[PDB]
Amino acid sequence: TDPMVTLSSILESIINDMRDLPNTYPFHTPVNAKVVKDYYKIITRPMDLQTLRENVRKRLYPSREEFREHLELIVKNSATYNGPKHSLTQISQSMLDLCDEKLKEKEDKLARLEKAINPLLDDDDQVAFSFILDNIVTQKMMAVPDSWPFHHPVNKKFVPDYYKVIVNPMDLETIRKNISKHKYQSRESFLDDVNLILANSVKYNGPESQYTKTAQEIVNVCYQTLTEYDEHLTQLEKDICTAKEAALEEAELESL
Numbered sequence: 001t002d003p004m005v006t007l008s009s010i011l012e013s014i015i016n017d018m019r020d021l022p023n024t025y026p027f028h029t030p031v032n033a034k035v036v037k038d039y040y041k042i043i044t045r046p047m048d049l050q051t052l053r054e055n056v057r058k059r060l061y062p063s064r065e066e067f068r069e070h071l072e073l074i075v076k077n078s079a080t081y082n083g084p085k086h087s088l089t090q091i092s093q094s095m096l097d098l099c100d101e102k103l104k105e106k107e108d109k110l111a112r113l114e115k116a117i118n119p120l121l122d123d124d125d126q127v128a129f130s131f132i133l134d135n136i137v138t139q140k141m142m143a144v145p146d147s148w149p150f151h152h153p154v155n156k157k158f159v160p161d162y163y164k165v166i167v168n169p170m171d172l173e174t175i176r177k178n179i180s181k182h183k184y185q186s187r188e189s190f191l192d193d194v195n196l197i198l199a200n201s202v203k204y205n206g207p208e209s210q211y212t213k214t215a216q217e218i219v220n221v222c223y224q225t226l227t228e229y230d231e232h233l234t235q236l237e238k239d240i241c242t243a244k245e246a247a248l249e250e251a252e253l254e255s256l
């Protein structure tokens, strides 16, 4: 018995429910780029319900968040293309609302499957690694003076052109959300996102901007603290690696 099939089937059942909701049809299939010739030129990350279903069946989504993140892309894309208040964006939001409803109704089962699919989400070493990361963000990085601009995602309302320039946005709240979801099994991925903050400030504000001087201070204090914790983190990453390999040993052995 394989929990990924059960999970994928739950998501597929939700896709079916959203397709059956009223007025959702313009999103059921990929945009026909041969009729609407500029579509993939405005939206960079196309998404639709057929490709989403195809990804669910290829088992690419091991948890609520990857599926929901791809689902939420549809709404952001309509908001971008149709406008933030277009009825279509409102209809894509109506499907997301039903989705949030189903995830809420079935949340205990979903938790059980998500943990069976990926046991690291219960590994005392993964949780501790994530806890340490969270403290670096809150106790060191968010304490940099005048670091408030990086605490939350940019609101396009206040910086109207930001996301036309920055295609890989990042912020400290998003990283914390990622930590809470245990996205990071090691310092490499964590630092990829951390360094992305500094790179983005350089691009949008310029190398000599005060925003970038603050971002340099944020990254520097992140590295200083990682260096201070090197030996414990190396041990945690090692135990995480071993748990991850055993979660294959005991995962695919069952598919037979």
Ligand SMILES: C=CCCn1cc(-c2cc(C(=O)N3CCOCC3)cc3c2ncn3C)c2cc[nH]c2c1=O
Residues within 6 Å of the ligand: 148, 149, 150, 151, 152, 153, 154, 155, 156, 158, 159, 170, 171, 201, 204, 205, 211
């Ligand atoms: C991911 C980090 C990008 C860093 N960043 C931020 C801003 C910035 C963001 C927001 C904003 O959207 N806010 C507030 C914080 O909470 C969410 C809502 C508001 C702002 C801002 N500057 C003045 N105000 C009033 C800005 C402006 C010019 N360059 C930048 C810049 O590089």
